[PDB]
């Protein structure tokens, strides 16, 4: 199954007549090796580090909230904790749910945001990182269709990699000193065809909000960025709907393609927008790739079984057009002991090698 | 003479079929009143403040250099002083010219740059400033030709005014974290027709240089900007030639227009590029306006008498097509005492009022 | 490797639908044999003969300047010496750097000018010189695209060769008595398609300057030509920017070609303009050829490794599209002793033989 899918991917990517996109999740930042440690400890790390940072003391309100969510949510996460805290702040919650903190919940969320900001505020080391290889592939060949990138992460790795290799891009904001969120140019969609486009669905660490005019602007990361929101904020002083609209509008073009790397399909809104756009445009494709074993992804299998133009691929088996297939007999592992048929090419580093090979 | 020039300027500006530009000099920042004091004391102020800052002591090197320049330059200028200092730094000047400072000339220029940064690093107060009126005029009516702005100033007033009123623009750099100087898109010249363009010929306070790769990028104003240069730097790690080329290339459009506000035509390179472009394209026009009396500008008179399509205007008289005319008899001043015929409409505040009147 | 590259060069040159250019450096004038001595002693000669002309006396200013430059420049050259002297002249250098020469620096640079002028003021002997063969090739076949020549030299050999074989050309100046530098026609670019174009980037020996109007004109070589400047002169009374711009503008034509003969890529500005134009237009090609061994050219190897459309060729190895290859096994030398694989065609005389063979 390796040769056929590899060749098909090569042919589909080599053509310059089709739109291309990416979705970048925590797998991409974690795939970078540093001091034999993860560069960013992903969502699970960002949860356990907060849990240990406030300690195991039951007097801590954050532990109380975590165990409260354990009753309803089997595996609560930082996104759920943040949304829960924001809801609790949204109404005058002076009751027993907030009996521990009459007003210290604001301090708790402030500390959580500051610690996340400090943890994800790093930079790309060297020039051998996979992001540099991806940008090299992007600017290697001029194509009549722009290459877009959708990011669910908070780090600025992709921007830095695109800047170092001198690839222009437009991320929504226009300006120099404290750039505003320009709306009209987003829907005009008449930027130079040579530009890329980098949409940040989940926000970023440098987005900030000024309450005096209740307007957002991207500047430099200061202490406490108020648009860290994992898609949980006010109504449309909010760019989230616009970025989702852009994803949808992209999906509806003819012969559209998309690739997800590091995505686990554990977000409801992303999943339903992908499904709805994939239904409205039968020509749309999603070549989802999972580095983990497929058995951990029931949501991905469900989505793949509900639609025929979603070539979901995994480490062990594959789902090609509502039919599930496993790895055919090939000498993937030379060693006789444990002859596991694993798709080692689904990891981000291997993907970057693949793109570099295509480009050269 | 008031009605004819006012009406014809109204007609030429009201049309949307012609390119328009501006040149913005120190007259525009000084025209702002603050505490009954100038917001920025202009080049003369930025010279006297440095002169008094090091005191009257003749043992100091800066006043030594100033009096050295007095022998050759009748009225030395901070531009000339900076160029002279940089030039002295270019070669191992251990001689009597630099006998006072074997190596302290670097500290002297560092202090000059730091004080310039501190003094020109301010912001627009309120929403009644003329820059806001200009931006309101720019975005008031959509025009098929983009409106450019060339400025030789160091302050970021124009950027702030344009982005507060939601006006997109492109100043050469493309990016988010540390935007690089993108070159190709500058000469492609296929940006969206709705965008303005803001070119900074003399550099800015936020431009910075990384000597590790000898590449420039625009970031945030930090401790000492290495692109403070009033057009005196290295060869083509330097964007000055590109912005000059952009002015020239603009001048060659058919039916092109240009307006200079606060410019005294005291810079030779700008003057020669204006003259050469005006000669190559007879359709080009320059409606240069001077706030001061005409007698103070010999260079402007020379250029106006040299070319036929340079409709130069002043406070007292005017030069329209190589012929000089004075103010016709009109009741400009109601008072019998001192019936001075002065074109008070040439001031920047009055100009902003005129633009607002045209827009409404 | 000989046959394939020779055939490919024959095919690319034989086509008449592509622009062609040349770059001529000191290798071409030195390749002429005269009295078993070099016709022009190249930059090394123009340095060492000046050094010996003023003698080894340490009291001389020129020897002091050379030893001063040795501290910063490991191998100072006549270009560097001239630039340093002009730079010292630019400011009232009455200090210890010029203590020996209160005003003798002007005399030193003068004497240098007349000496180099006398040394490079010669003529083509006979009709068997390679320049005659090149001109014969140029006018042998009518081509729809003009053949340009860029010269970094000061000699008038190429003009004489083109005149003798009746080949028209335009070198920028238009006129008969004191031909002025016409600017408009340069950028109109509507000369007759049969004309060649000869651009002099580094100036030439017959250019002169009149200080009364501060305008340049080409006349006859008189006592002291004020435009021998190797690209170190005043701002845009200076045609250097125009000729460099012409090189750049040429590089942007589709399917453009270029050949450098005798160039060592030792000039920063030419190198960066070549790199930038080669980057902007991937269709641009540079078939740089070196008569010397490639191991002496780190700059050329760097440039070739940074771009993919620069088929750099040398005497021993070759760099074809960012990949380095060496000479394949062939009986290049019949003698068993020292079977060195050397590309004898890289010398100018052999190149002229190749061109005339192609033409016939």
Tab-separated table of N, CA and C in Angstrom, chain A residues 122-123 142 156 159-160 162-164 166-171 174-185 188 190-195 206 218-220, chain B residues 122-123 142 156 159-160 162-164 166-171 174-182 184-185 188 190-195 198 206 218-220:
chain	number	residue	atom	x	y	z
A	122	UNK	N	8.422	30.394	22.255
A	122	UNK	CA	9.751	29.940	21.887
A	122	UNK	C	9.976	30.255	20.413
A	123	UNK	N	11.102	29.783	19.884
A	123	UNK	CA	11.494	30.077	18.514
A	123	UNK	C	12.084	28.835	17.863
A	142	UNK	N	6.452	27.999	-8.506
A	142	UNK	CA	5.344	28.934	-8.634
A	142	UNK	C	4.119	28.215	-9.181
A	156	UNK	N	4.367	30.682	17.078
A	156	UNK	CA	4.636	31.450	15.874
A	156	UNK	C	5.684	30.791	14.992
A	159	UNK	N	5.026	31.290	11.029
A	159	UNK	CA	5.360	32.628	10.556
A	159	UNK	C	6.862	32.813	10.456
A	160	UNK	N	7.597	32.370	11.475
A	160	UNK	CA	9.044	32.546	11.480
A	160	UNK	C	9.687	31.781	10.334
A	162	UNK	N	8.270	30.945	7.491
A	162	UNK	CA	7.935	31.575	6.219
A	162	UNK	C	8.715	32.869	6.016
A	163	UNK	N	9.024	33.579	7.102
A	163	UNK	CA	9.807	34.802	6.987
A	163	UNK	C	11.265	34.525	6.666
A	164	UNK	N	11.868	33.528	7.313
A	164	UNK	CA	13.297	33.304	7.127
A	164	UNK	C	13.615	32.919	5.691
A	166	UNK	N	11.799	33.765	3.224
A	166	UNK	CA	11.262	34.843	2.400
A	166	UNK	C	10.113	34.351	1.519
A	167	UNK	N	9.045	33.925	2.184
A	167	UNK	CA	7.776	33.578	1.557
A	167	UNK	C	6.728	34.563	2.064
A	168	UNK	N	6.154	35.401	1.210
A	168	UNK	CA	5.160	36.364	1.682
A	168	UNK	C	3.884	35.666	2.104
A	169	UNK	N	3.163	36.279	3.035
A	169	UNK	CA	1.872	35.733	3.410
A	169	UNK	C	1.009	36.818	4.028
A	170	UNK	N	-0.291	36.556	4.040
A	170	UNK	CA	-1.302	37.467	4.564
A	170	UNK	C	-2.105	36.709	5.607
A	171	UNK	N	-2.069	37.173	6.851
A	171	UNK	CA	-2.760	36.497	7.938
A	171	UNK	C	-3.962	37.269	8.443
A	174	UNK	N	-3.645	44.042	8.419
A	174	UNK	CA	-2.965	44.952	7.512
A	174	UNK	C	-2.544	46.191	8.276
A	175	UNK	N	-1.245	46.461	8.300
A	175	UNK	CA	-0.720	47.609	9.004
A	175	UNK	C	0.673	47.352	9.535
A	176	UNK	N	1.241	48.405	10.115
A	176	UNK	CA	2.635	48.387	10.533
A	176	UNK	C	2.826	48.588	12.027
A	177	UNK	N	2.236	49.629	12.607
A	177	UNK	CA	2.505	49.916	14.010
A	177	UNK	C	1.738	48.965	14.923
A	178	UNK	N	0.408	49.007	14.861
A	178	UNK	CA	-0.482	48.114	15.606
A	178	UNK	C	-1.601	47.712	14.647
A	179	UNK	N	-1.327	46.695	13.835
A	179	UNK	CA	-2.134	46.434	12.654
A	179	UNK	C	-3.537	46.013	13.032
A	180	UNK	N	-4.521	46.586	12.359
A	180	UNK	CA	-5.905	46.266	12.645
A	180	UNK	C	-6.323	45.006	11.907
A	181	UNK	N	-7.515	44.523	12.233
A	181	UNK	CA	-8.106	43.400	11.525
A	181	UNK	C	-8.921	43.910	10.351
A	182	UNK	N	-8.332	43.946	9.163
A	182	UNK	CA	-9.070	44.399	7.993
A	182	UNK	C	-10.031	43.321	7.526
A	183	UNK	N	-11.291	43.696	7.329
A	183	UNK	CA	-12.341	42.741	7.012
A	183	UNK	C	-12.603	42.660	5.516
A	184	UNK	N	-12.726	43.809	4.848
A	184	UNK	CA	-13.168	43.805	3.460
A	184	UNK	C	-12.219	43.030	2.565
A	185	UNK	N	-10.914	43.256	2.709
A	185	UNK	CA	-9.949	42.594	1.844
A	185	UNK	C	-10.005	41.083	1.997
A	188	UNK	N	-12.897	40.193	-0.366
A	188	UNK	CA	-12.636	40.536	-1.761
A	188	UNK	C	-11.880	39.410	-2.446
A	190	UNK	N	-8.733	39.147	-3.624
A	190	UNK	CA	-7.989	39.522	-4.819
A	190	UNK	C	-6.559	39.926	-4.478
A	191	UNK	N	-5.940	39.218	-3.540
A	191	UNK	CA	-4.537	39.410	-3.240
A	191	UNK	C	-3.686	38.897	-4.398
A	192	UNK	N	-2.423	39.316	-4.476
A	192	UNK	CA	-1.540	38.779	-5.517
A	192	UNK	C	-1.460	37.263	-5.438
A	193	UNK	N	-1.519	36.619	-6.604
A	193	UNK	CA	-1.571	35.161	-6.649
A	193	UNK	C	-0.311	34.514	-6.095
A	194	UNK	N	0.769	35.274	-5.955
A	194	UNK	CA	2.015	34.721	-5.454
A	194	UNK	C	2.051	34.630	-3.935
A	195	UNK	N	1.129	35.289	-3.241
A	195	UNK	CA	1.118	35.267	-1.785
A	195	UNK	C	0.561	33.948	-1.265
A	206	UNK	N	0.150	36.583	20.125
A	206	UNK	CA	0.394	38.002	19.916
A	206	UNK	C	-0.873	38.804	19.673
A	218	UNK	N	-3.155	42.943	16.116
A	218	UNK	CA	-1.983	42.109	16.331
A	218	UNK	C	-0.760	42.990	16.492
A	219	UNK	N	-0.054	42.824	17.600
A	219	UNK	CA	1.137	43.606	17.851
A	219	UNK	C	2.305	42.741	18.266
A	220	UNK	N	2.867	43.019	19.433
A	220	UNK	CA	3.906	42.182	20.002
A	220	UNK	C	3.386	41.523	21.267
B	122	UNK	N	6.683	59.795	19.435
B	122	UNK	CA	5.456	60.270	20.049
B	122	UNK	C	4.277	59.688	19.278
B	123	UNK	N	3.075	60.134	19.636
B	123	UNK	CA	1.854	59.602	19.053
B	123	UNK	C	0.871	60.732	18.784
B	142	UNK	N	-13.852	55.658	-3.144
B	142	UNK	CA	-13.030	54.676	-3.836
B	142	UNK	C	-12.655	55.191	-5.220
B	156	UNK	N	5.984	58.039	13.146
B	156	UNK	CA	5.009	57.087	12.640
B	156	UNK	C	3.596	57.648	12.665
B	159	UNK	N	1.242	56.303	9.588
B	159	UNK	CA	0.777	54.933	9.755
B	159	UNK	C	-0.346	54.863	10.771
B	160	UNK	N	-0.159	55.506	11.922
B	160	UNK	CA	-1.148	55.449	12.990
B	160	UNK	C	-2.467	56.056	12.545
B	162	UNK	N	-3.595	56.309	9.473
B	162	UNK	CA	-4.250	55.493	8.459
B	162	UNK	C	-4.854	54.231	9.057
B	163	UNK	N	-4.217	53.656	10.075
B	163	UNK	CA	-4.752	52.410	10.607
B	163	UNK	C	-5.856	52.652	11.623
B	164	UNK	N	-5.888	53.820	12.263
B	164	UNK	CA	-6.998	54.104	13.163
B	164	UNK	C	-8.312	54.214	12.405
B	166	UNK	N	-9.067	52.738	9.685
B	166	UNK	CA	-9.286	51.538	8.886
B	166	UNK	C	-8.996	51.802	7.405
B	167	UNK	N	-7.735	52.119	7.124
B	167	UNK	CA	-7.236	52.318	5.768
B	167	UNK	C	-6.072	51.354	5.550
B	168	UNK	N	-6.196	50.375	4.661
B	168	UNK	CA	-5.080	49.460	4.417
B	168	UNK	C	-3.960	50.158	3.673
B	169	UNK	N	-2.736	49.683	3.879
B	169	UNK	CA	-1.616	50.190	3.104
B	169	UNK	C	-0.478	49.186	3.121
B	170	UNK	N	0.443	49.365	2.181
B	170	UNK	CA	1.605	48.502	2.006
B	170	UNK	C	2.844	49.382	2.001
B	171	UNK	N	3.733	49.180	2.968
B	171	UNK	CA	4.941	49.982	3.078
B	171	UNK	C	6.194	49.214	2.706
B	174	UNK	N	6.574	42.655	4.274
B	174	UNK	CA	5.533	41.642	4.333
B	174	UNK	C	5.889	40.624	5.398
B	175	UNK	N	5.018	40.464	6.383
B	175	UNK	CA	5.255	39.531	7.463
B	175	UNK	C	4.625	39.995	8.758
B	176	UNK	N	4.734	39.128	9.760
B	176	UNK	CA	4.054	39.330	11.032
B	176	UNK	C	5.002	39.433	12.215
B	177	UNK	N	5.935	38.496	12.360
B	177	UNK	CA	6.808	38.511	13.527
B	177	UNK	C	7.918	39.546	13.368
B	178	UNK	N	8.784	39.360	12.373
B	178	UNK	CA	9.807	40.336	11.993
B	178	UNK	C	9.716	40.471	10.480
B	179	UNK	N	8.839	41.352	10.017
B	179	UNK	CA	8.537	41.403	8.598
B	179	UNK	C	9.782	41.751	7.810
B	180	UNK	N	10.058	40.973	6.777
B	180	UNK	CA	11.231	41.205	5.956
B	180	UNK	C	10.915	42.188	4.841
B	181	UNK	N	11.965	42.662	4.182
B	181	UNK	CA	11.806	43.536	3.030
B	181	UNK	C	11.585	42.699	1.782
B	182	UNK	N	10.333	42.516	1.378
B	182	UNK	CA	10.057	41.753	0.170
B	182	UNK	C	10.297	42.611	-1.058
B	184	UNK	N	10.344	41.363	-4.671
B	184	UNK	CA	9.670	41.056	-5.926
B	184	UNK	C	8.311	41.725	-6.012
B	185	UNK	N	7.521	41.646	-4.942
B	185	UNK	CA	6.179	42.208	-4.971
B	185	UNK	C	6.204	43.709	-5.204
B	188	UNK	N	6.392	43.861	-8.993
B	188	UNK	CA	5.246	43.246	-9.656
B	188	UNK	C	4.132	44.264	-9.839
B	190	UNK	N	1.123	44.538	-8.530
B	190	UNK	CA	-0.221	44.001	-8.693
B	190	UNK	C	-0.910	43.803	-7.348
B	191	UNK	N	-0.724	44.746	-6.429
B	191	UNK	CA	-1.475	44.753	-5.192
B	191	UNK	C	-2.931	45.109	-5.478
B	192	UNK	N	-3.841	44.792	-4.557
B	192	UNK	CA	-5.242	45.177	-4.754
B	192	UNK	C	-5.375	46.679	-4.945
B	193	UNK	N	-6.229	47.069	-5.893
B	193	UNK	CA	-6.351	48.477	-6.251
B	193	UNK	C	-6.888	49.325	-5.108
B	194	UNK	N	-7.457	48.704	-4.083
B	194	UNK	CA	-7.990	49.451	-2.958
B	194	UNK	C	-6.914	49.891	-1.975
B	195	UNK	N	-5.740	49.269	-2.005
B	195	UNK	CA	-4.702	49.569	-1.031
B	195	UNK	C	-4.040	50.906	-1.336
B	198	UNK	N	2.549	53.423	1.333
B	198	UNK	CA	3.270	54.415	2.114
B	198	UNK	C	4.757	54.111	2.041
B	206	UNK	N	11.563	52.589	13.384
B	206	UNK	CA	11.361	51.187	13.716
B	206	UNK	C	12.135	50.236	12.818
B	218	UNK	N	11.568	45.299	9.573
B	218	UNK	CA	10.835	46.242	10.402
B	218	UNK	C	10.218	45.506	11.576
B	219	UNK	N	10.479	45.991	12.780
B	219	UNK	CA	9.953	45.370	13.976
B	219	UNK	C	9.303	46.385	14.887
B	220	UNK	N	9.788	46.482	16.116
B	220	UNK	CA	9.326	47.498	17.042
B	220	UNK	C	10.489	48.395	17.431
